Symmetry: C4
Subunit: 219 residues, 4 copies
């Protein structure tokens, strides 16, 4: 039976039947958004949903026999597995983000269809080339996030009261979002020199971010 089903699984139909299902469950998940719609056809799609999930667990079971060890060394397959595993955790108990993480299965459209995979892989491949940069930056963030907490957290604890808060704020200043009128001018009303912290912070971080872009243009 091994070769029987290995012929079912690798068939253009089977794979095209799944891709057909992704687009249906995605269309169906957009419909689950409407508080009105759910009032009419809520049960249609609750069942239809549990239905697709079985189909999806069946496939992943089928796909493993056919691939064995090869399946758990393929990123895309591991993925498909975890995105379905998530989709199996009961509609109850624990945390309920897991209910919302069920929508992550529409990322199977990225998996099941190549080209997307071409492009996604294309994107991801640039990440190893960025890790030296990313690492640098994280040290830098880490250091300043610390200074800022102990420089501004007493008067300004929403923004800097905690190490994590400073991180967040720093992220915001880095994305250059409301940084002056929102954060640094306020800070200066108490600490006239805070500009001395934040203007330099902006330079290094914009410079770094620029360099990283010119580097992704090194290919």
């Amino acid at each position: 039976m091994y070769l029987r089903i290995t012929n079912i699984v690798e068939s253009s139909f089977f794979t095209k039947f799944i891709i057909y299902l992704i687009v249906l469950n995605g269309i169906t998940m957009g419909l689950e958004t409407s508080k009105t719609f759910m009032q009419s056809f809520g049960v249609y799609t609750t069942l239809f949903n549990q239905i697709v999930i079985t189909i999806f667990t069946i496939e992943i079971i089928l796909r493993i026999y056919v691939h064995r060890i090869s399946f758990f060394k393929d990123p895309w397959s591991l993925f498909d597995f975890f995105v379905v595993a998530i989709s199996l955790v009961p509609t109850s108990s624990g945390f309920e983000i897991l209910r919302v993480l069920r929508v992550l299965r529409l990322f199977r459209l990225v998996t099941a269809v190549p080209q997307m995979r071409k492009i996604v892989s294309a994107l991801i491949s640039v990440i190893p080339g960025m890790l030296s940069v990313i690492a640098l930056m994280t040290l830098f963030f880490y250091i300043f996030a610390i200074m800022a907490t102990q420089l501004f957290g007493e008067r300004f604890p929403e923004w800097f009261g905690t190490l994590g808060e400073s991180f967040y704020t720093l992220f915001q200043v880095m994305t250059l979002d409301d940084w002056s009128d929102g954060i640094v001018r306020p800070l200066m009303e108490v600490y006239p020199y805070a500009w001395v912290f934040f203007i330099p912070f902006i330079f290094v971080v914009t410079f770094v971010m620029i360099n990283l872009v010119v580097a992704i243009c090194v290919d």
Copy 2:
């Protein structure tokens, strides 16, 4: 008469007479902006407008004889037809955006003058090579737009109440416009971890957009 008019239409004079009309109607539409101006010369320019609109239909009628099917397979020609047709729809009934879209005819200065034609085409040509990225992105948006609506739409409906609102709001976060002080800091006031949803969204979406720019710096 075919060859008569094919030599009328294809003449430098014809084209340059139209181009003379574009820059005149365009000047005249800037003039229709002023509530003052309209109180003196509103009559001049409403009639002048109907005049230019005839001239433009006459031209388009003529241009079709000279080209036949060749005309309805030219992008630039179709346009002028569509934009003139828009400018034909009466000044009453239906919606009023059709009145306002009349100003779209000034895009004939792009259509009826080369180099512009070159440049626009140069731009558009880059699009097909973005279509894999653009597509990737639209899935991602679609996914998160769904997640957000069911995570925040109860307490924060203006921003996330409806799928369409989540899209808009997400766009705004992507353009990085008031994302922290406007949306995410507020959101965290009720859902402390919302930072866990939006910072990641920011990285990917910003990354993706970076790749797309380096890609355009490939062709």
Copy 3:
């Protein structure tokens, strides 16, 4: 005396003396900022300034005889002429921006030092190759600015009431500054579809500017 002064003017010393003056009057203009300082040395500086202006006119007088027609065909020389001319208009009569445009003379530091001339010229040279783009864009702005004035100026005249206002507002949307929370969300409170006008505006204008940057990173 012609060859006498052509040897005075073309001297390293002549130029280095002027350059010495630029840095001093610039230093002195940074000093004229203090309401305090003017109260202790206002006259020292008012006279020093009137002094340097002569020194610069004497130079321009000399420089012209030494160059004749060659002078009014050198950009840089014309500049220094017009910049110094501005600096000649009296303190009392006319517009008072003219008093402020005097500080434009510090741009002579750009004019009198060749290494700067290199870079400034480097910058400017890219502009001709953007004129095809810059034009495209100006047409676009012109058309939309017209559309917006007639779509929003009745309920929202501050942002859109006048042809020029829309330009300003559109610019702000384009620099992507508070476009959503500042303008488009408000606008949607009356005209639900304004999102239909402004998102597409953002795409084109963002796209175009990407192309223009990729184009410069081509030349």
Copy 4:
């Protein structure tokens, strides 16, 4: 003993021990953030901290005997000295920013581990190629900062009242942060033409920065 210690200092184990301490002290510093933690194990940390600082002076003492003049001509070594020196200044008292500046020692993780060194150096090298451009920009800023102070500082002293303030504000406009709704629309409420000052400022400054980015991609 010279060769004794030269074989101690240059040892892989020596290098590994210090890098061990950096990751420990940086971890140590993150914990120093919690007002909770400090009440519990504050003592543990302040002594371990003084301990590490001893170790670090000893290392630099040893390292100099082993390099003599060679040390104070190495950028990275100077840094380590100047950073540890900062950490040497007692817990009192004049400026307490000196206490905060202690955390700068975590940049030794940048210093003691190569590849980081590789990358940082890569970043720094681009600076010389921007200095004509950075200079250009600084003169430009300097000139406008003066004009703005004298054009708006009477009515808008918070933003423009002082040379330094104009600098801050201009920087804010340049980073393109809240520039319209925060500054220029206001300004215009009193001085209708301020748009004539800031739009042009924005073009140049945006252009130059773009040029500087393309200039970087050149190297």
